[PDB]
Amino acid sequence: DGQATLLNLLLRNYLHYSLYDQAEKLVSKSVFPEQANNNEWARYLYYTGRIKAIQLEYSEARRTMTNALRKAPQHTAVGFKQTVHKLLIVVELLLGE
């Protein structure tokens, strides 16, 4: 519960920034917070999806975008589900499919 929220809550403005902490997120130990309650856990895979988007999707994270999508709930799409619905394919337009 401290391994979970303190990392998307760490991520949310570093993504908006261009700080080095994407490779720090590579070498981070807390990349798994161990069943992070399907809300932070669900969006977490998106938050690491846009990491390899700006660091050059090589079809690695379209499964973690897809996985972030399928772990997302039934509430409304306008929250973030628009942007995973857009960005999820944005990286597969990068592939060609």
């Binding site: 039934q74 509430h75 409304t76 306008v78 929250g79 973030f80 628009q82």
Partner: protein, 40 residues
């Protein structure tokens, strides 16, 4: 349940694939063939 933090705020699908392929292509054939009769 469903707190869902907000950073921002058939009938359709067979029609959507024929929308995909049948998208922006001449739209109005009654005259295209009848003008290819004499030009082609």
């Amino acid at each position: 349940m469903s707190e869902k933090k907000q950073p921002v705020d058939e009938d359709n699908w067979d029609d959507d694939n024929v929308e995909d392929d049948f998208s922006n292509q001449l739209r109005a054939e009654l005259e295209k063939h009848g003008y290819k009769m004499e030009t082609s």
